[PDB]
Amino acid sequence: LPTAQEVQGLMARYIELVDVGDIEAIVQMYADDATVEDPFGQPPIHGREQIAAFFRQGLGGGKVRACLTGPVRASHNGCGAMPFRVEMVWNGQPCALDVILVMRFDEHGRIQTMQAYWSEVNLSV
Amino acid sequence: NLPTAQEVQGLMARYIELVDVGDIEAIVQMYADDATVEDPFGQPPIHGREQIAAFFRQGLGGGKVRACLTGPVRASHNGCGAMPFRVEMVWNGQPCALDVILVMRFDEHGRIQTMQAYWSEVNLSVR
Numbered sequence: 735l736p737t738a739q740e741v742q743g744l745m746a747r748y749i750e751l752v753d754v755g756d757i758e759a760i761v762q763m764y765a766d767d768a769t770v771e772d773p774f775g776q777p778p779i780h781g782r783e784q785i786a787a788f789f790r791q792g793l794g795g796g797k798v799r800a801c802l803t804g805p806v807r808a809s810h811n812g813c814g815a816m817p818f819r820v821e822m823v824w825n826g827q828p829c830a831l832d833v834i835l836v837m838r839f840d841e842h843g844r845i846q847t848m849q850a851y852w853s854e855v856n857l858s859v
Numbered sequence: 860n861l862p863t864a865q866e867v868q869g870l871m872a873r874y875i876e877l878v879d880v881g882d883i884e885a886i887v888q889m890y891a892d893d894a895t896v897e898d899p900f901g902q903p904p905i906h907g908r909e910q911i912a913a914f915f916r917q918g919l920g921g922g923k924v925r926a927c928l929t930g931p932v933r934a935s936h937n938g939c940g941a942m943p944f945r946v947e948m949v950w951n952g953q954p955c956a957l958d959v960i961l962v963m964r965f966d967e968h969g970r971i972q973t974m975q976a977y978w979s980e981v982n983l984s985v986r
Binding site: 809810 | 864865868899900901929930931933934935936937939940941942943958959960962977978979980981982
């Protein structure tokens, strides 16, 4: 069960993995039976196979940039939240998306649940 | 009347305004009667307006707390939103800043049903 400082580290690395687009390293940060709700409000994705398919589709050939826009907030029960921005172009016009991610880690330092808050009101193009 | 994403951004932005001014009463008014609060997340939750009101009395009550948004409010389509903000106050006899992230869920009447605040000592900064 990751300490507060370890959570900050695990989460910062996660944005780094998204920014570079290493899909396989991203999937390995998740527990084998992790759950993903992105966007929060829609039905959750379950398991690495489904999570992998989700990322291969989203970060696939997309060429995306992602960066923390503020410090990672972490608690003492293996949970944390962070604000970040996702930028693309694919259309000639710069597009941005502001998101806040909430994660709960397990006793092995793997992501058990992940929830991303954002909607169309967070798009800026 | 479950708030839309845009209404959530408004409600949450308003919440911080009240915390800044210090209107403790206007804040408790925003919570539903059987609302739940977890601040900081990881601690046992407080149930009911009574406890909640008692809670804010202790915290915001004593101390000239200051607070501002540090980024836009993220909002879902099912009455939930999350936002990042900073709190400024006097900690253990020193000027300090606290970086926080709040997660809220509203009910069918625009009242806060659940509130969870993420922060720890790792989010504490001097001056």
